[PDB]
Structures are given as C-alpha cells and as structure tokens.
Design a protein around this ligand. Structure first.
Ligand SMILES: [Mg+2]
Ligand SMILES: [Mg+2]
Ligand SMILES: [Mg+2]
Ligand SMILES: [Mg+2]
Ligand SMILES: [Mg+2]
Ligand SMILES: [Mg+2]
Ligand SMILES: [Mg+2]
Ligand SMILES: [Mg+2]
Ligand SMILES: [Mg+2]
Ligand SMILES: [Mg+2]
Ligand SMILES: [Mg+2]
Ligand SMILES: [Mg+2]
Ligand SMILES: [Mg+2]
Ligand SMILES: [Mg+2]
Ligand SMILES: [Mg+2]
Ligand SMILES: [Mg+2]
Ligand SMILES: [Mg+2]
Ligand SMILES: [Mg+2]
Ligand SMILES: [Mg+2]
Ligand SMILES: [Mg+2]
Ligand SMILES: [Mg+2]
Ligand SMILES: [Mg+2]
Ligand SMILES: [Mg+2]
Ligand SMILES: [Mg+2]
Ligand SMILES: [Mg+2]
Ligand SMILES: [Mg+2]
Ligand SMILES: [Mg+2]
Ligand SMILES: [Mg+2]
Ligand SMILES: [Mg+2]
Lengths: 172, 172, 172, 172
C-alpha cells in the first residue's frame, strides 16, 4: 500500500481509471472529427481547427486525472482507446451534435464519479472534480448547444452556404 | 561538352527544357485568369489577386528550372509559350476547376520527369524534383480542391452571392 | 474518387492508415511510461517529463500522417489504440530499453512503408517519409541507445543512485 | 452572540480552534527540523532551508484559520504549542519520514473537520477547507513521499553521500 494513500477508496481509484480512458476516448473522437473537416471534399478549415483544439484539451484532461491518481497513491491502469463510433461525420452540424452528445456523456460519467466520491466521503476528490471538470463540462455543453442552434437556424446541413459562413464567423 | 556536366543524361536535359515551357505556360494561364476577374462585368478583385500571385509563382518555378539546367551543364532551349485554352473563364468556380486540372497536369509531367531521372539513376535530379516541386504540387492541388468544394457547396456558379462571399472570406 | 487523388495507390493509402495507428500507439506508450515515473514510489520527475514530451511528439507525428492522407486524397480510417504492453515499467533503464525497442519497431514500419511507396513509384510519398520520419527515427534511436548505455555504465537498475543522477544530469 | 455569526455551529468553532493549534504545532516541528540540519555535525543547508520554508508556510495556515474564525464570528482560543516529539531527527531521510507522518496526521484532522462541517451543513466552511487546505495537504504528502522514495533509493541514511547529493539536486 502506497505511503501517500489516505481516505482514497479502491472504488474511487477504479472510477478514476475509467474516467482516464473516457477522456482519452473523447480526445480521439475530436481528433477524428477534426480531420474529417480537413478532407478536400469537406474543406472547412475552422471546423478542423476547432475540433483539433478540443482534442488537445481532452488529452490535458486525461493527463490531469493521471496526475491525480498518483497524487492520491492510486495506480494507473490503462485500457485500449476505442475508435470513434463514426468514420464519416456527415456535416458540420452533425459533428457538433455528436460533440454535444459526447460531452453530455462525459458529464454524466463525472457526475457518477462525484456521487461515488461523496458516498465514500472523499472531499478532496469531490473538490477536484468540481474545480477542474464540472464547470468545464457545463461550459463546453453550453457552447456546443449554442453552435448547434446557430447552424440549425442558418439552414444547415442542407445549406452549404450556412456551414461555410459559420466556419468563418463563429469558428474563425 | 560542359566542364560541369556529370551524370546528366541528354534525355533528362530535354525533359527539363519541356518542363520549363510547361511552367511558363502555367504562368500564362494564371495571368489570363487573373485579369478575367478584373473585368468590370466579373469584378471579383480577390480572385484576380489570387491568380496573379499564382502566375508569379509559376514564373519562379520556371526560373528555378532554368537555373538547374545551367547548374548541371545542360543547355536551355526555349519554345513558344502557348496562349491559354480559354479567353472567357465563365465563373470563379470554372476558373478554379481549370486551375485544378492544370496543376494535376503539371504534376503528371513532374512525375514523368522523376521517373526518367530514376531510370537514368540521377539522384541529384530526383532530389531536386522532390524538394522543390512534388510537395508544392500536392499542396497546390489540395488547395484548389478545397476551393472548388467550397464554391460548389456555397451554390456556385449560379449563386452570384456565393462567388462574392468566397472572394471576401477565403481569398480575402 | 477524390478530385485531388493522383498517383496514390490504394495499398499506400491503407499503409498510411496503419502507420497513423502505430504513431498513436507510440504516443500512448510514452504517456504510460511518463506517469510511471510520476508515481510516489518511483519519483523521477525528469524521466516523467522526458517521456511526456516524447508522447506529445508522437501525437504530432500521427497528425501529420492524417494531414498527408487528406492531402493525397486518401480517406482516414482509424482503429482502436491498443494499451501499452506493460503497466509497471520496472525502472528507468527498463523504460528506456522499451522505448528503444518501440522506436526500432516504428522505424521498421516506416521502412516497409517506404518500400511500398518505392514499389508503387510514389516519389512524393517517398520524400514525405524521408523528410519527416526517417531521420527523426534514426535520431530518436541513437538518443535512446545513448541513454541505455549511460544508465548501464552508471550501474542501473540496481543503483538507485544511478537513475537519480541520470534523471538530474541527462534529463534535467 | 456575534452580529456576523450565521450557520456556524459551536462544534465547528471549537474544531477550528483545535486546528489552529495543530497548524502552529506543525510550524514548530518544521522549525526544529530546520535547525537540526544547520548543526555543524549535520550540515545540510538545503534541508535546513526546505524545512524552514515549510515552517513559515504552516504559520500562514494557522493565521488563515484565525482569520476564518473571526470571519464567521467565532472566538479564537489558543492553547500551548507542544514541543516536537524529537530533539535529534537522526538523518535527512528520518526527518522526511517524520514530516510525511505529520502531514498525514494534519490531513486526517482536516478530513475530520470537513466531516463535521458536512454534518452541520456548513457549506462555506466545507468550501474553505477544500479550497485552502485539502489539496495543499495532498500536494505536500505527495512531495514528501517522493522525497522519502528518492532518499531510500539513493541509499540513505547509511550513504552520507546520498543525503549530500539529494540536498544539492532536489532541495537546491
Ligand atoms: Mg476503462
Ligand atoms: Mg473543451
Ligand atoms: Mg474531458
Ligand atoms: Mg470496435
Ligand atoms: Mg458519435
Ligand atoms: Mg461539497
Ligand atoms: Mg469547491
Ligand atoms: Mg470553479
Ligand atoms: Mg466578415
Ligand atoms: Mg517545349
Ligand atoms: Mg502555386
Ligand atoms: Mg509550377
Ligand atoms: Mg494555337
Ligand atoms: Mg483550361
Ligand atoms: Mg520537402
Ligand atoms: Mg458574410
Ligand atoms: Mg491499424
Ligand atoms: Mg521523439
Ligand atoms: Mg513517431
Ligand atoms: Mg488487449
Ligand atoms: Mg514495451
Ligand atoms: Mg532531412
Ligand atoms: Mg487545542
Ligand atoms: Mg507545505
Ligand atoms: Mg498546515
Ligand atoms: Mg511535554
Ligand atoms: Mg515526529
Ligand atoms: Mg483548489
Ligand atoms: Mg550539478
């Protein structure tokens, strides 16, 4: 048993490992989305940049959880990072909707993680989740919601013009 | 025979002269396209600027091949530069599609040139083509492909609005 | 078929997708190694920093291959990123030896990729591999070899002092 | 009763006074450790500096709790600050191990304090503990764990060389 470990339940340790995998998975989804918009037959460079940045952010979220695992004296256990559900993301709007769904899924995982930390009376872990993750998710979800709304109102995905102009004005 | 010449096949020499002509021809095509968009009844100033820059770049590509010819001890032999196939380029989209076709043609000529250089075991010439031309063509072809895609998705050439907005957002 | 595609064999396309997966896998291995040295019972902070940087570099290598795939008009197809072979990397020396083995494996994959590109007479792809990958691998392999040598000569892995001092002088 | 007091249980008030004493006690332990390494027959100047800084930090932690007591309308009640358990700390490693034990003890007191604040439904006090103390303890405990690990691996306390080099490379 680790010399630093204190008030850190084995269940929380495992949950943090699961969250690490989910963060890496989200990174992979955004990476895939990014390069979809880099295709010569899609060619929306700011969608590509937007999702690539989101991908790098998710890798940062994973790293911070790996740091936390070690901080508390838990042991990191990695699993395969699953390929994203889709190869062809269809359109700017569809990618945004998939991103919204991903972020809400990640948020639900974090809320379950927080419930466990609360159940195990781990206020350090509760504070960690709240501080670094919960509002970050709420902000990300609000942003994607805003984006989906604008694309829909502008006439996407039918209007190729709409996705083009959104790429320039919102993501540019 | 030139005091500098070494491992430079007469076939490669002739192929380099042919490539020089093709580069000058591409310069001429882009020059013609440029001023088409400068017409008062077309009036897309950023299309005009975009193609003029492309025209100057092609002249640079020709000059570098003339430099190479002399570097290797070959002798430059120039031919007439043919006028472009078209006087009226129709629309922004059509010009972009013609540019894409030109660049793919130039690329095929360069790949044939590379095949010959390989056949004649001329690694200096192979490296020259690879370094200065091959990725330049791949980048140019990708860019034009991206442009054609956006114009099509935006509704060109029917939508005069589409070509106008593309002129401002992508080429501006 | 892609409007930009030219001289790009389907076999090369698939090989590039396989290489993308391998680059992401290498990123994952280095990420795992990094946090191993961040454990309170290992606690070599410069080993951790060194491998984390290597991990980020591998993600850059993957992204550039995804860019290339689109540049040539191929289509990206992602697969699961396998977890690294090891959870516990044992020691600084052992991690370095595993890194050396990984880089030599990645190098062999790149040489096979180059052989295919040569077989299919794709000089753009040959140049791409040579320019961005081949010397990078040779440099990485030489560096890891140097590191393994120093750690061995210093008395690792038995000498805890040796790994400590190497962490400070070579990786610091 | 204080004009500012609101939702502040008498039990929490007393617990905060106990925590103030513990913070001052920790300050005293680190002060004693510091000057042990300043002895002419120990003479590790960076161990001395490291612990002196830790001592000043603990005094800051005590002051912030005294501030909090007044903020909430509680009344500060001070008790004797007990001398540290040891006069002679034996070695760099032993001092680090004693520091680790102290910080884990202080952490347990803070977790008990948080449990009480939770029991009394005092979210301001919960947030105060989480914000200013809980992660600070986790970080301190991780650091000391790392230090103990390195000293052990380097051969301390038998190796006088090990403590000397650690003093220079880690604490310098
Ligand atoms: Mg998992
Ligand atoms: Mg984000
Ligand atoms: Mg995340
Ligand atoms: Mg599957
Ligand atoms: Mg999806
Ligand atoms: Mg709370
Ligand atoms: Mg909080
Ligand atoms: Mg916050
Ligand atoms: Mg504007
Ligand atoms: Mg000719
Ligand atoms: Mg050009
Ligand atoms: Mg040219
Ligand atoms: Mg004629
Ligand atoms: Mg034409
Ligand atoms: Mg190059
Ligand atoms: Mg507009
Ligand atoms: Mg694969
Ligand atoms: Mg590297
Ligand atoms: Mg690599
Ligand atoms: Mg497996
Ligand atoms: Mg391995
Ligand atoms: Mg090079
Ligand atoms: Mg007391
Ligand atoms: Mg401290
Ligand atoms: Mg304290
Ligand atoms: Mg006493
Ligand atoms: Mg003690
Ligand atoms: Mg905090
Ligand atoms: Mg030194």
């Amino acid at each position: 048993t680790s010399q630093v470990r204190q008030n850190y339940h084995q269940d929380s340790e495992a949950a943090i490992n699961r969250q690490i995998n989910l963060e890496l998975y989200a990174s992979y989804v955004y990476l895939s989305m990014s390069y979809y918009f880099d295709r010569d037959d899609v060619a929306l460079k700011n969608f590509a940049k937007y999702f690539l940045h989101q991908s790098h952010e998710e890798r940062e979220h994973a790293e911070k959880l790996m740091k936390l695992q070690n901080q508390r004296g838990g042991r990191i256990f990695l699993q395969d990072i699953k390929k994203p559900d889709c190869d062809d993301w269809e359109s700017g709007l569809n990618a945004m909707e998939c991103a919204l769904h991903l972020e809400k899924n990640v948020n639900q995982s974090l809320l379950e993680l927080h419930k466990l930390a609360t159940d195990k009376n781990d206020p350090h872990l509760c504070d960690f989740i709240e501080t670094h993750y919960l509002n970050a998710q709420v902000k990300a979800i609000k942003e994607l919601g805003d984006h989906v709304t604008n694309l829909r109102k502008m006439g996407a995905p039918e209007s190729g013009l709409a996705e083009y102009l959104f790429d320039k004005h919102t993501l540019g």
